[PDB]
Every structure is written in C-alpha cells, then in structure tokens.
Copies of this chain bind each other. A is one copy, B any other.
C-alpha cells in the first residue's frame, strides 16, 4: 500500500497549490467584527434580512463542501499529493463556515441566529440547490466509481466553488464597497481568496479525468455539465429574485452570477456561456 512521497511528483501543480493553501491559512479570530455594528444598525430592516439570509446560504454551501464534496472526491483520487491538497481545502471550508457564525454573533441575537438557521434548513430553493450538488457527491458512496461519476462530482464542486457562492458573496462585497460592514467584508474576501484557488485546482483535476474518458463518455459528461449549469442558473435566478427584490438589486446580482458562472466554466476548460459584462463597480471596490 502506497504512502504519499513528496520527493517524487505525481503531477506538476499539487505542490504549488499545497503551498498556496497553507500560505493563505487564516482563522476567524484574526478579524474582529464588532466595529461593523456602527454601520449594521444603519441598514434598513430589509437590508439586514437580506444580509443574514445570504450568510445563511453561504454557510450551507460551505457545510456541504467541507463535509461531503471534498471528502468524497478526495477518497477516490489515485494521486496522493492531490488528495492532500483537497483534504486541506475541505478543512478550510469548515473554517469558512465557522467564520460566518462569528459574524452572526456580532450582528444578531441568539434567537435571531437560530431563526436564520431554521430558515435555511426549511428553505425550498436552498434545499433544491444543495440537493442537486450533493447528489453528485453521494453517487461516490460506493467502493468503485466510474470516471464519469468522479468527473461530474468535480464539475459540481467547481460550480459550487466558482459560481453558486456568488449570489451570496455579492451583498457583503456590495456593502463593503460602500464602507459598510467592512470587517465582515474582509472575512468574505479571505473566503473568496480560498474559494478561487479551490475552484481552479478542482477544475485542473477534472480536466485531467476528462482527457482519459472515451469520446462517447466525453460527449455524455459535456451534455450533463451544460445541463447542470442551466439547472443551477434557473435556481439561482429564483433565489436572487427572492433575496434581492426587496432591496432593488436583482439584476445587479444576476450579472454577477453570470460573470462567475463563466469563471467556473473556464476553470473546467470550457467556453463561457453568458455574454461578457463588467462587474458591478461597487462590488469591485469591495474586492479592492
């Protein structure tokens, strides 16, 4: 049985991603968020509700990526160096999820927080979205998987990392780009710095597997990938309508969703599917 041997490279990229994920290591204790209270209380009721709801959705996605997506993809990898990288990435999803609780503790009462997490658990669109992604992961709960199954789990992972988070990341970035909730915005920026490299790395692994598939299997997973992209898009457009209509930001968020969907596709080596548009300028300042 093989032990991981970093003296003999299994690929040309796992070491650099290992080092970069460690270099980016952080935990929530590093960013105090209490100073956000001064701008939090200046938001309207509708703005506060949107913020809490999107954070709840982000927590759900990170919960599933750390507890299902990364573990079940990594257990089926043959490349032990890449497995190492995915194990660290999965731990960082748990760090991310805990950081959202850290933000909640400053912005809400214990009762309000438990109300948000009940809203998340019972939400039909979040349940549908997370069920679509995790179905690909749970297909891997068997000893022998096909490369089509592993590839599509990696596609689902890239779409979560590079695309599904961004209807939620929009609002902390949009507020931070205006000087509102800037400490929470700093945390979200650390999270995005991690998810960006997560999506790139899993997309590399996916492209490697894709190249080993037969032409027939390649055609099949290309179809599944484009169908999954649009299945998720329909759900995302319903979600943005629900979250952002009250605060007048639906079309801005939809533009941002499409921009990031194109990035997810590019991480998989695929052509963009949505017309190119420039990021919202305030969001861009919030990333600055």
Residues of A within 8 A of B (CB): 1-8, 18, 22, 25, 27, 29, 56, 59-60, 62-64, 66-68, 70-72, 74-75, 80, 83-84, 87-88, 90-95, 97-98, 101-102, 104-105, 110, 113-114, 117, 120-121, 126-127, 130-131, 134, 138, 141-143
**Contact A110–B1 (Cβ < 8 Å):** no
Inter-chain contacts of A80 with B (CB < 8 A)? 63, 67
Q: How far does the alpha carbon of A113 sit from the alpha carbon of B2 in the complex, in Å? A: 13
Inter-chain contacts of A74 with B (CB < 8 A)? 67, 71
**Contact A71–B98 (Cβ < 8 Å):** no
**Contact B93–A87 (Cβ < 8 Å):** yes
**Contact A130–B97 (Cβ < 8 Å):** no
CB < 8 Å: which of B7, B18, B93, B138 contacts A143? Answer: B138
Q: How many copies does the complex hold?
A: 2
Given the interface contacts A97-B84, A101-B6, does A127 sit within 8 Å of B1 by beta carbon?
A: yes
**Contact A60–B3 (Cβ < 8 Å):** yes
CB < 8 Å: which of B1, B56, B105 contacts A60? Answer: B1
Given A1-B130, A5-B117, A7-B110, 12 extra CB contacts under 8 A: A1-B60, A1-B120, A1-B127, A1-B131, A2-B120, A6-B102, A8-B110, A8-B117, A67-B75, A84-B97, A84-B98, A141-B143
Given the interface contacts A22-B27, A84-B97, does A7 sit within 8 Å of B104 by beta carbon?
A: yes
**Contact B94–A84 (Cβ < 8 Å):** yes
Given the interface contacts A84-B97, A97-B84, A121-B3, does A68 sit within 8 Å of B75 by beta carbon?
A: yes
CB < 8 Å: which of B3, B75, B93, B114 contacts A120? Answer: B3
Q: How far does the alpha carbon of A67 sit from the alpha carbon of B1 in the complex, in Å? A: 13
CB < 8 Å: which of B93, B117, B138 contacts A2? Answer: B117
Closest to A25 in B: B25
